[PDB]
């Protein structure tokens, strides 16, 4: 059940597809980034077509939509990383056992604003000054305020300890960071290669 906007993969299960400048998909992803990163230079945008990562993610989404009894569990977020992590993320997605600060818990971190992910500490410039940021589908679901040392989100009710929040944030009224603690709660959808 692979998304309609994907391009044919000749019966392959993994392809990085460079987007054409000026077309709608490219323009939509460009604007999300330039909203807060209009001072940077975009070299290219790639659609991540990972069928295995996509089905594992869609299964979790269907599970969360049922458990939460609504379908507002998904957000579009940013993740800056180093050149050496890119092949891993394209192929295997986000892994909390890899991850800088972890002051809201030991999970994978996603930014509301591209400009947060554009910091050199996250989108580390390679030899050439090239920086890498993903546009990520993440199942934030029902979230609470994080804190240092969490290995999973907290329970909603301390009297049902196993019924958990889906994600954690820096601030529930006005979130700028989300962290998720489970594989396949995030799908890396686009890779933006850019420079200062």
Ligand X SMILES: COc1ccc(OC)c2c1sc1nncn12
Q: Which residues bind a second copy (CB under 8 A)?
A: 13, 52, 55-56, 59-60, 63, 66-67, 87-88, 90-92, 95-98, 106, 151-152, 161-162, 164, 181-184
Which residue has tokens 């330039």? 34
In the complex, the smallest distance separating the C-beta of residue 90 from a second copy, rounded to whole angstroms, is 8
The residue among 124, 122, 129 whose CA lies nearest residue 100 is 122
In the complex, the smallest distance separating the C-beta of residue 78 from ligand X, rounded to whole angstroms, is 6
Q: Which does 79 bind (CB under 5 to 8 A by kind): ligand X, a second copy, none?
A: ligand X
Give yes or no for a contact between 83 and 147, defined as CB atoms under 8 angstroms apart.
Answer: no
List the structure tokens of 74: 């998904």
Give yes or no for a contact between 179 and 167, defined as CB atoms under 8 angstroms apart.
Answer: yes
In the complex, the smallest distance separating the C-beta of residue 30 from a second copy, rounded to whole angstroms, is 28
In the complex, the smallest distance separating the C-beta of residue 177 from ligand X, rounded to whole angstroms, is 5
Which residue has tokens 């929040």? 165
Q: Which residues bind ligand X (CB under 6 A)?
A: 78-80, 99-101, 109, 111, 116-117, 122, 177
Instruction: Find the radius of gyration of the CA atoms of the chain.
Output: 17
In the complex, the smallest distance separating the C-beta of residue 121 from a second copy, rounded to whole angstroms, is 21
Pairing of strands 167-169, 177-180: antiparallel
In the complex, the smallest distance separating the C-beta of residue 65 from ligand X, rounded to whole angstroms, is 26
DSSP string, 66-82: HHHTSS--EEEEEEEE-
* C-beta closer to ligand X: residue 40 or 122: 122
Q: Which does 109 bind (CB under 5 to 8 A by kind): a second copy, ligand X, none?
A: ligand X
* C-beta closer to a second copy: residue 1 or 174: 1
Q: Which does 111 bind (CB under 5 to 8 A by kind): ligand X, a second copy, none?
A: ligand X
* C-beta closer to ligand X: residue 1 or 97: 97
* C-beta closer to a second copy: residue 116 or 140: 140
Give yes or no for a contact between 152 and 104, defined as CB atoms under 8 angstroms apart.
Answer: no
How many other CB atoms are found less than 10 A from the CB of residue 83?
16
């Amino acid at each position: 059940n692979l998304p309609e906007h994907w391009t044919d993969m000749n019966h392959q299960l993994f392809c990085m597809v460079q987007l054409e400048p000026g077309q709608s998909e490219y323009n939509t992803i460009k604007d999300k980034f330039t909203r807060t990163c209009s001072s940077y230079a975009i070299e290219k945008i790639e659609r991540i077509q990972n069928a295995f990562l996509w089905q594992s993610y869609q299964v979790k989404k269907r599970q969360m939509d049922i458990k939460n009894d609504h379908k507002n569990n998904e957000r579009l977020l940013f993740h800056g990383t180093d050149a050496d992590s890119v092949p891993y993320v394209n192929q295997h997605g986000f892994n909390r056992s890899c991850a800088n600060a972890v002051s809201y818990g030991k999970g994978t971190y996603f930014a509301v604003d591209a400009s947060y992910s554009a910091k050199d500490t996250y989108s580390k410039p390679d030899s050439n000054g090239r920086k890498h940021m993903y546009v990520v589908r993440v199942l934030t679901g029902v979230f609470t305020k994080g804190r240092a040392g969490l290995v999973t989100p907290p329970p909603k009710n301390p009297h049902n300890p196993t019924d958990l929040f889906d994600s954690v944030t820096n601030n529930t009224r006005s979130p700028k960071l989300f962290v998720v603690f489970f594989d396949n709660q995030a799908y890396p959808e686009y890779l933006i290669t850019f420079t200062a």
